[PDB]
Design a protein around this ligand. Structure first.
Ligand SMILES: *[C@@H]1O[C@H](CO)[C@@H](O[C@@H]2O[C@H](CO)[C@@H](O[C@@H]3O[C@H](CO)[C@@H](O)[C@H](O)[C@@H]3O)[C@H](O)[C@H]2NC(C)=O)[C@H](O)[C@H]1NC(C)=O
Ligand SMILES: *[C@@H]1O[C@H](CO)[C@@H](O[C@@H]2O[C@H](CO)[C@@H](O[C@@H]3O[C@H](CO)[C@@H](O)[C@H](O)[C@@H]3O)[C@H](O)[C@H]2NC(C)=O)[C@H](O)[C@H]1NC(C)=O
Ligand SMILES: *[C@@H]1O[C@H](CO)[C@@H](O[C@@H]2O[C@H](CO)[C@@H](O)[C@H](O)[C@H]2NC(C)=O)[C@H](O)[C@H]1NC(C)=O
Ligand SMILES: *[C@@H]1O[C@H](CO)[C@@H](O[C@@H]2O[C@H](CO)[C@@H](O)[C@H](O)[C@H]2NC(C)=O)[C@H](O)[C@H]1NC(C)=O
Ligand SMILES: *[C@@H]1O[C@H](CO)[C@@H](O[C@@H]2O[C@H](CO)[C@@H](O)[C@H](O)[C@H]2NC(C)=O)[C@H](O)[C@H]1NC(C)=O
Ligand SMILES: *[C@@H]1O[C@H](CO)[C@@H](O[C@@H]2O[C@H](CO)[C@@H](O)[C@H](O)[C@H]2NC(C)=O)[C@H](O)[C@H]1NC(C)=O
Ligand SMILES: *[C@@H]1O[C@H](CO)[C@@H](O)[C@H](O)[C@H]1NC(C)=O
Ligand SMILES: *[C@@H]1O[C@H](CO)[C@@H](O)[C@H](O)[C@H]1NC(C)=O
Ligand SMILES: *[C@@H]1O[C@H](CO)[C@@H](O)[C@H](O)[C@H]1NC(C)=O
Lengths: 724, 208, 183
């Protein structure tokens, strides 16, 4: 029987399908099929061809994306897509009028447009061009320029800078339409005094001279960009200047962040602010006073969230989900025991009321109606690495009803959901630990309407392959239960002793051990090279309580490192793991941990790989770093900024085999970091291996580069484990 | 035998007020086979469903076809009082009717396009008093009287036409005004089906 | 050429200006909405600080005029170059479309300043007795929602469509009622 070879991983020979849809109603969604865009109605099961693939290639050129207007009158076509960063880009957009079924030729959308978003209702447009905000009341209507200070690397209106897109918003967008489309809320960023990172780009062999790329990148303690929030009335845009909503006073004592903007009603806006010392968060509720007319942000509806053991939220404070009347909201907060649970806020009330509790966390709030609230939790079977859909009755909080627990309990233990408007229907997505699945459900009776994708083709293709097995198990460290996972080789024999390879992230609020089904590189090693690939969620991990999560606070590189070693020591006690063939590798925080582990002097690991590793917290951006480590000042936390460098551990690298990989175009984890490591390894008489990948970004993902780094790492591990 | 839709796929489609009509008796039809040649945008039926129109038997089936822009879809409702159902084209209420708006795909090249869509937006009569206007509203399954003076394709939006009636023909004037809508990239058409039931002649059935 | 002077700021407006060689311009009866004619096309500005919306796009000199009279209409009928009629609320705009394409044109020479070496010839569509007269059409446009619903023509009564005819007067009765005098 065939095995999962390396070519099977790198060539995507074994494709896993999914089912991605866009709810455009309370009962209709769009789905792309055979390059056609089909419009499905879940209330009747009937579906029409909404957008022929004929009218996708008959424009002049290849179209990259689409976005249909909420009134289904116009379609945006995106083409000439040029990648900027993780979530950012610039492209040209066309407008396709569906009433005439004709392409719009006048009042077009300029080339090099950065952002674009429809209004929630109707057909109004807002786009960002040369870092300025423009609005179009109609595709057949001239643009209205809102801002005029758009300066590259200085001022951005409506689009995020680098740190916000990466570490806060997780999207390039800084436009927020009002539900009626009357108001637009946009953010203005100012990176004028933010220091710049500079790295060279060695483009095609034609380029005689390299390019120098500049990016405003505040490192730990550096000058941070400012943000201001302005609101604009689209219906009477030529009456007043954009109205700034000043941040609350609580956050104005120094530098601060803007982390979320949500619309409660057609005339009420909510702003989540965050201090720079990220243990203080506040929600401001602002109503439109049509008199002056200003935005009236009453103090009595300010809502504070703090943390005594560290920072607020998991990565950033939870976003509020307002009720249909915008006079209350539900947001996730840590209870007294330190577990993320759902709390009920009244806009005018100073306290919140918890509606869920237990020794388990709530992952997120998925949908909200007047009678039920839908959410995801890791409560089922007390397994933190699982995800299941629940619903809460808003009259009797004791009446919690899991919607995914008993559907296929052996095959599916990791669910997610995508709801429609008003939570009439919801798409269920199972991710593991067996073959994924996608189904359509109706919230009225929670019955499966139809099976969207079963991956049956995947199922039979794996039947002919000696696939490895994934075990979800746990262990105890100083009396605390800690979960881990093992990818076991096929025909696993506990009497025989296998080599061990540890996959690390160990990042704050990370979770590497979970009931998810992946066709990864580890799948190759176990199925073919018969290597046990493990991952251990120790201290600093998430979804297990603020006790375990905040243990790493202000002490990065201390406990998440020891516990990877200590768990590795536990694995040796088992009778099926070779003591002399234990390895480790990571990526962008594992590479930090993997490096910091090999420098611990543990005599546990034989070799290691660090891919785009962090080497010192002095080098990473302030938003992620200062959240867990604070400021590098002698008065705040400068001590452990220095005590936690990989370079301080060079001498102990004489005992292991180090392989260091890093891409040169890395805008996230700068090549400066790996360079500082090698200088410490060189200056210490330590021999090691290295490999750069030219013009590859942080997540090395170019087809040629993705295949090369893993084919390189396979040779390394096989040489370290003395494998064929 | 087989219902011949050949006249619909060949030549230049007429304008809405000069609509061509295909009457079908004693034949076998496959609706979905015909609609598979087009890009059907809207399919609305009265007193019958679009699923039933393609699968039931009738004594006689009528199919009016003409050129029609998708932009004016709102005016093809028989309940509307606009200058289409007033002066150009109207379906009967006394029998099940269906309305199909299509788009001629790029790979259907035997349908030629005209310069533009045209329609009569006024057709009235002036009596011998030279003072009284009598708008000539079109009846169902019949042509507008003003097609004698309105050309097959209106030259320009606003062009008016006139004809003086002989005394035997009522005296006075026959007066009409036309309008135009710019041609689309792909010719957009309209189809109107109307089925009838007779005693023994139930001879229009879907084939097998 | 026309400048706009803001009285709220007491300052001159510099952006979205009104083009040079503008032929006609009329405020709305209420508020601050502008309508002007430039190259024989009708343009509307919901606000001085707002971009112009082009309503008609067939403006050709001595053939098609939108919103401005031709010669005989200005001299003998309208006694004004204007053919824009606002709605009392400013919602609607009634504009006139003249077509002198086959109207014969008079030609006379102009002997300008002694600098001009060769005399200019001036052409003017001028229907003499019995000549082809210009046509006129009346269109109405909703200013508040101009994007959809391309201009709506108000066809002349049938009593006047027996042959050539003129348009003498356009008056607004109410905010939704309009009166047209035909001849
Ligand atoms: C974007 O940020 C830059 C810098 O963060 C802002 O420009 C800077 O503004 C400060 C004051 O806010 C200026 O500093 C000093 O101001 C004092 C006032 O007494 C003056 O006496 C000093 O001579 C000095 O100017 C600083 O010069 C200035 N730097 C510049 C203009 O490069 C800028 O205003 C921000 N822009 C936006 C749109 O937020
Ligand atoms: C402005 O006025 C001119 C002249 O009055 C219009 O152009 C002319 O339009 C007529 C028909 O309305 C064309 O005459 C003939 O039409 C018949 C139709 O059967 C055709 O077979 C003949 O070959 C001939 O074309 C005439 O050619 C045309 N002259 C041009 C275009 O120079 C014009 O349409 C009017 N425009 C507006 C906006 O009112
Ligand atoms: C969208 O909502 C806004 C605010 O609710 C509407 O604006 C107000 O509308 C009310 C009536 O609905 C008027 O009495 C106010 O004068 C309006 N004020 C402002 C500042 O707009 C707006 O009309 C709504 N628009 C749509 C299309 O629903
Ligand atoms: C948020 O964290 C900061 C520092 O991490 C805390 O600042 C302390 O403030 C008190 C004043 O009440 C000082 O006595 C301490 O010296 C400060 N600590 C440091 C390290 O500077 C702040 O109290 C925290 N906020 C909350 C609400 O817990
Ligand atoms: C969907 O795929 C699953 C596989 O994940 C199918 O379930 C298997 O069906 C076979 C029948 O030959 C059983 O022997 C297995 O025990 C099943 N496995 C699991 C994990 O349930 C299922 O039949 C497929 N459904 C459809 C409709 O094709
Ligand atoms: C000016 O008048 C017009 C027409 O009288 C108004 O438009 C209508 O306003 C009514 C409310 O009075 C609405 O119910 C209609 O839907 C509107 N229709 C159209 C076509 O506009 C307009 O609102 C008035 N505006 C002002 C500023 O007085
Ligand atoms: C376009 O869609 C049709 C619909 O069946 C399909 O047959 C065809 O293969 C598709 N073409 C492409 C290029 O996706
Ligand atoms: C589904 O059926 C309903 C009623 O028959 C119809 O209104 C709707 O348009 C249909 N769905 C689609 C996508 O056309
Ligand atoms: C009618 O046409 C459709 C279109 O493909 C086809 O599927 C069906 O088999 C045809 N029926 C007959 C009886 O030919």
């Amino acid at each position: 029987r065939r095995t999962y070879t390396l070519a099977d991983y790198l060539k995507s020979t074994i494709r896993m399908r999914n089912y991605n849809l866009r709810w455009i109603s309370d009962h209709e969604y769009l789905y792309k099929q055979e390059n056609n865009v089909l419009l499905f109605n879940a209330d009747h099961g009937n579906s029409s061809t909404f957008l022929e693939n004929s009218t996708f290639d008959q424009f002049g050129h290849s179209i990259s994306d689409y976005s249909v207007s909420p009134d289904r009158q116009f379609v945006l076509f995106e083409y000439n897509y040029v990648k900027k960063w993780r979530h950012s880009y610039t492209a040209s957009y066309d407008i396709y009028d569906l009433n005439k079924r004709q392409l719009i030729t006048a009042e077009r959308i300029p080339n090099d447009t950065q952002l674009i978003r429809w209004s929630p209702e109707g057909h109004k447009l807002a786009y960002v061009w040369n870092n300025d905000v423009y609005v179009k009341n109609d595709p057949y209507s001239p643009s209205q320029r809102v801002t005029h200070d758009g300066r590259e690397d200085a001022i951005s209106n409506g689009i995020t800078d680098w740190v916000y897109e990466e570490e806060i918003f997780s999207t390039h967008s800084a436009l927020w339409w009002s539900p009626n489309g009357t108001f637009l809320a946009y953010a203005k960023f100012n990176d004028t005094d933010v220091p710049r990172i500079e790295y060279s780009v060695y483009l095609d062999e034609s380029l005689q001279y390299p390019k120098t790329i500049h990016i405003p990148y505040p490192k730990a303690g550096a000058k941070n960009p400012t943000v201001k929030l302005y609101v604009v009335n689209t219906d009477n845009l030529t009456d007043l200047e954009p109205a700034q909503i000043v941040a609350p006073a609580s956050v104005l004592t120094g530098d601060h962040y803007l982390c979320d903007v949500t619309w409660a009603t057609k005339e009420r806006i909510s702003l989540q602010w965050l201090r720079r010392i990220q243990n203080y968060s506040i929600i401001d509720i602002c109503d439109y006073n049509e008199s002056t007319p200003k935005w009236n942000c009453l103090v009595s509806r300010q809502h504070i969230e703090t943390s005594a053991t560290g920072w607020v939220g998991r990565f950033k404070p939870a976003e509020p989900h307002f009720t249909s009347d915008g006079n209350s909201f539900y947001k996730i907060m840590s209870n007294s025991e330190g577990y993320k649970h759902i709390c009920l806020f009244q806009i005018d009330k100073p306290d919140c009321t918890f509606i869920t509790k237990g020794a388990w966390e709530v992952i997120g709030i998925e949908a909200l109606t007047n009678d039920y609230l839908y959410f995801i939790s890791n409560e089922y079977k007390g397994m933190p690495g699982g995800r299941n859909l629940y619903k809460i009755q808003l009259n009797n909080y004791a009446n919690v009803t899991c919607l995914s627990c008993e559907l296929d309990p052996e095959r599916c233990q990791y669910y997610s959901a995508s709801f429609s408007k008003g939570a009439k229907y919801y798409q269920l997505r199972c991710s593991g630990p067996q073959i994924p699945r996608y189904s359509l459900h109706s919230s009225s009776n929670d019955k499966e309407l139809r099976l969207l994708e079963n991956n049956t083709a995947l199922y039979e293709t794996l039947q002919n392959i000696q696939m490895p097995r994934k075990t979800l198990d746990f262990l105890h460290l100083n009396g605390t239960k800690f979960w881990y996972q093992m990818i076991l080789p096929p025909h696993f024999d506990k009497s025989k002793k296998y080599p061990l390879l540890i996959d690390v992230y160990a990042g704050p609020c990370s979770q590497k051990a979970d009931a998810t089904f992946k066709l990864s590189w580890a799948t190759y090693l176990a199925s073919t090279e018969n290597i046990i690939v493990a991952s251990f969620d120790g201290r600093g991990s998430g979804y297990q309580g603020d006790k375990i999560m905040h243990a790493i606070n202000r002490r990065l590189g201390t406990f998440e490192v020891e516990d990877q070693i200590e768990a590795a020591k536990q694995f040796s006690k088992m009778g099926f793991v070779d003591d002399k063939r234990i390895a480790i590798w990571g990526w962008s925080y594992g590479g930090y941990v993997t490096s910091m582990v090999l420098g611990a002097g543990s005599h546990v690991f034989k070799c290691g790989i660090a891919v785009a590793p962090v080497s010192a917290w002095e080098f990473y951006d302030s938003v992620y770093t200062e959240r867990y480590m604070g400021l590098p000042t002698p008065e705040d936390n400068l001590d452990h900024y220095k005590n936690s460098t990989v370079m301080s551990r060079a001498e102990n690298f004489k005992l292991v085999e180090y392989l260091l990989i890093h891409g040169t175009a890395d805008d996230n984890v700068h090549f400066q970091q790996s360079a500082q490591i090698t200088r410490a390894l060189v200056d210490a008489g330590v021999d090691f291996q290295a490999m750069w990948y030219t013009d590859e970004d942080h997540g090395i993902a170019t087809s040629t580069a993705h295949q090369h780094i893993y084919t390189h790492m396979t040779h390394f591990i096989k040489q370290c484990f003395s494998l064929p | 035998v087989e219902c011949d839709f050949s006249p619909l796929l060949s030549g230049t489609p007429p304008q809405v007020y000069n609509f061509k009509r295909l009457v079908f008796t004693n034949c076998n039809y496959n609706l979905t086979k015909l609609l598979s040649l087009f890009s059907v945008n809207d399919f609305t039926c009265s007193q019958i469903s679009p699923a039933a129109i393609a699968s039931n038997c009738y004594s006689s089936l009528i199919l009016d076809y003409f050129s029609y822009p998708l932009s004016m879809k709102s005016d093809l409702s028989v309940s509307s009082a606009g200058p289409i159902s007033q002066f150009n084209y109207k379906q009967s209420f006394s029998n099940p009717t269906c309305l199909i708006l299509a788009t001629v795909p790029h790979n259907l090249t035997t349908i030629t396009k005209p310069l533009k869509y045209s329609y009569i937006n006024k057709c009235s009569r002036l009596l011998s008093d030279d003072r009284t206007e009598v708008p000539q509203l079109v009846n169902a399954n019949q042509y507008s009287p003003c097609v004698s003076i309105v050309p097959s394709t209106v030259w320009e939006d606003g062009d008016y036409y006139r004809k003086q009636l002989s005394p035997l023909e009522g005296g006075g004037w026959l007066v009409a005004s036309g309008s135009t809508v710019a041609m689309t990239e792909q010719l957009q058409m309209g189809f109107g089906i109307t089925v009838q039931y007779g005693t023994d002649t139930n001879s229009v059935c879907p084939k097998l």
